Amino acid sequence: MERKISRIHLVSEPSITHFLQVSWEKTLESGFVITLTDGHSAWTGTVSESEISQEADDMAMEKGKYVGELRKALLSGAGPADVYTFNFSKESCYFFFEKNLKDVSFRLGSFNLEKVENPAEVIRELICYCLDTIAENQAKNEHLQKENERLLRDWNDVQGRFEKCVSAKEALETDLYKRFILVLNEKKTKIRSLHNKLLNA
Template identity: 50%
Template sequence: MQMRMDTSLRRIEVSSEPGKIYFLRVTWEEDLGSGFSVDLCDGQSVWRGKVSEEEVSKEAQEMEMKRDIYVDELCQALTAGGKQTNNYSFDLSKDPADSHTLHFSYEKVLKDVFFKLGSAELHTISKPIEVIKELINHGLDRSSELRARNEHLLGENERLGRERDYVTEELKKYVQAKEVLEQDLYTRFVLVLNEKKAKIRNLQEKLKQAQEEVESELQHRGDTSTVESKAPAEQDYEGSTDEESIENENPRPSTSARGWDPPSRNQVAAISPQRNLQPQPGAPQTQKTSLMTSSPQCLWHNLTVPDCFVVKYIHVVGLFFLYDR
């Protein structure tokens, strides 16, 4: 099975003949490292040569370069990687022994320093017209391929441009819709926020009013308890005992109006100290019993001022009664 041949055609100038144009065609199967064929044409004559794989490896060893790197340099120099470059120089020299043989060399230029990459021995072809036709056909085919590729790229570019315009319009619509949506959401948010603020203010007012009511109720209760605590003391001073009420209802007759009648024994017993004393508010209920059952000394110390006068009166009446007897 015959393998497909790759071909590169480029235009070069040689340093030995400035201004003269040559066309260089390089053909290879796998890559330049496996060997390649060189055709050089000046428009009238054609020279052809071949570089074997062994020669490529030998040149790489002489330059102390790895084979892959050297093959890349050859591709840049002979095919220019599809681009025209000034980093490489070409030269032709005739063989003094054979006028139909040319020595074709190619070098790399680094800051005016030339490094020889390799050379090939070219021989004149007897029928250059066929090779020139092949070069023209290759150029036309390549031009057609590039034109078709260019048209394809132009079509892709137009399609991408239309898609870009469509996407731009859609994006503008989305941006407008987003702005409308944002405005709507912002308006709703403002309404909700204002409503929440109004509710918060209302709740704060209710809370403040409730606190004022609680404080007023507590102050009212405190004033009421203060008045109730003062009322019993005032009643103690303003009230009267049973003996005072009895004396007011039954006043004692004076001795100046008529003769004094001493009381009988029953009368003395009736006005004895066993009288009903009203207990003061808040005093324990056992106070009355203790007053009635206590000794005369304890009873005397527990009597109030009106009670003392009553007891004195009873004592005096008793003495008169005993004296009269």
């Protein structure tokens, strides 16, 4: 199950905010559950795969692009491309959303919602889910912060060790060389003395 909560301003009442809860199991195409709440009354409904397919075919538009637009609208993934407006009457239970551009409206979609007898349960479930996400995100962020600290510390330590290594390496060459010189010179003295003794004969 995947869930997304969004804030929509219904065009019947401008100041008050309304909340849209959209849930889908595997992918949005298969159908989704939509619940609209406003703090005192809620409406629940579902849209099945056959319904979305009929909507797309009746729009004579590619299914992929229609799904993209639907996600951009209901899941609030809209950018500066355009604007959408939502409509809902409390007596008909006929929700419908359109995309507005240049004084031209596209009835992007419509649903036939219904009342739910008990709003307390749905409101409480919503708040509970919000809090759960807050907690999970906080914990994961804390753990990632700790990991970042560890990474910084170890990177600094390794850089220090590398500095030591580079400082020592180039220097060590001459320290190696000088005693090669010493041993070679010692054997040199030995050979010269031996030759002098031999010539003394």
